[PDB]
């Protein structure tokens, strides 16, 4: 146990074990040899000072020990010559996601082993390497991990409702929250009050510009006929009937309500905890209806296709501002067909509803 260039007797942990040749060099001689090789000699002269030692990944391993036992100015020239004489560009520096160690990696493979934690990771997505990722894109791999994380599927449809964010229509801030039972949403960043289902504005007192509105002196909004503001009053069975008639599948069984809400604190995360009835996919009643309405909105299903005459007359006075009147010779089917025809032609679905 002694330095191979000066003979100084030191323990093994007092010297530097050169990885390429395992010739132990004391700290001072290791330092002084490699600076004069950088100061007066060329990059090819960075050979070991003890032994004799075209695979030049030796610079990647030497860069580690050079970073430790060298001055910053001398370590800067080593990088300068490495790019000005070997690489014609900066070296690719990789950070290990599991141990936070930085190292130069200039190899062929997509997998890279950390010289510290000795774990292998993909150079693109920086996730830990597995045999499943071989031959697959990183997008395919991390989705296979999400499709195999027991704690992720245990949350159930709560993750689906949170994936559908609430985007503020004016400040565009994204909130990874479920809409819940109440449609009113106040954005912390811009103080905008809007409906979380149709993204229309909640007008204050005497600020509503819509014509023929009879509640202008009150806080309110105007919602399309397919917004959750209205479809929340439908029963789960009738919401499912609109889905079944268009061959849209929906969950009834799970594949307190675990849908994450926000708790007011001097905001904390808190589960819904409401009763999860049978046939509601383990969700709350309001959160299950939100789940069905999102399916309805995604496929742009028209709830007016299930309207009866009284509902069609209410919709005609609301969105067309004309009290309908049956014409002579019409039966209930014809009167219903005419009102449904005019509504679907003149009043579209939610133009701002997230689909």
């Amino acid at each position: 146990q002694e330095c191979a260039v000066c003979g100084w007797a030191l323990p093994h942990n007092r010297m530097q074990a050169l990885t390429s040749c395992e010739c132990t060099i004391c700290p001072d001689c290791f330092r002084q040899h490699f600076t004069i090789a950088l100061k007066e000699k060329h990059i090819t002269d960075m050979v070991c000072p003890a032994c004799g030692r075209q695979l030049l990944s030796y610079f990647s391993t030497l860069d580690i020990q050079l970073r430790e036992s060298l001055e910053p100015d001398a370590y800067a020239l080593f990088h300068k010559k490495l790019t000005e004489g070997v690489l014609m560009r900066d070296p690719k520096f990789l950070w290990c996601a599991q141990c936070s160690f930085g190292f130069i990696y200039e190899r062929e493979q997509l997998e890279a082993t950390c010289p510290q934690c000795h774990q292998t990771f993909c150079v693109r997505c920086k996730r830990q390497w597995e045999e499943q990722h071989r031959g697959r894109s990183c997008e395919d791999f991390q989705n296979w991990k999400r499709m195999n994380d027991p704690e992720y599927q245990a949350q159930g449809l709560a993750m689906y409702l949170q994936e559908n964010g609430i985007d503020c229509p004016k400040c565009k801030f994204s909130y990874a929250l479920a809409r819940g039972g109440c449609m009113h949403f106040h954005c912390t960043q811009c103080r905008h009050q809007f409906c979380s289902g149709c993204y229309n504005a909640f007008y204050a007192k005497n600020k509503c510009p819509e014509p023929n509105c009879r509640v202008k002196k009150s806080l309110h909004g105007h919602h399309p006929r397919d917004c959750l503001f209205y479809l929340r009053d439908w029963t789960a069975l009738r919401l499912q009937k609109l889905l079944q008639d268009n061959n849209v599948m929906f969950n009834t069984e799970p594949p307190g309500c675990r849908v994450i809400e926000q708790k007011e604190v001097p905001l904390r995360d808190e589960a819904c905890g409401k009763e999860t009835p049978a046939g509601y996919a383990g969700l709350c009643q309001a959160h299950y209806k939100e789940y069905l309405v999102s399916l309805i909105n995604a496929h742009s299903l028209d709830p007016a296709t299930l309207y009866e005459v009284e509902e069609l007359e209410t919709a005609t006075e609301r969105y067309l501002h004309v009290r309908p009147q049956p014409l002579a010779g019409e039966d209930p089917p014809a009167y219903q067909a005419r009102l449904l025809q005019k509504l679907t032609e003149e009043v579209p679905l939610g133009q701002s509803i997230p689909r």
Partner: nanobody
Amino acid sequence: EVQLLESGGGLVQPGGSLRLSCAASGFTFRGYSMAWVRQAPGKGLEWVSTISPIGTYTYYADSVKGRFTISRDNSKNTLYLQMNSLRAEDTAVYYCAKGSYSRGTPFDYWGQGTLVTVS
């Protein structure tokens, strides 16, 4: 959004004990490595320790390898750092970092930090 809230720093005589916390939110805590870093007055940022996602692996700097102990609680979404036998050169602002899977950095988020002084 992502938020890291450190707490537990203050004044403590040399040789004492101090336990720091870092409550995390806005991301899957159990899926990322966490770490502690510090910055002494008039000096550069220094890495202290890093812990693996579920806690099977811990890495420490040579100056704190046996004196400090990093730990996490995925059920509580909080990272801990137990500091024992604090020396004079431990006075620094302590940040908790969130490991990143993005190219170009080992961490993508740092907290506000807590000041720690030793007498």
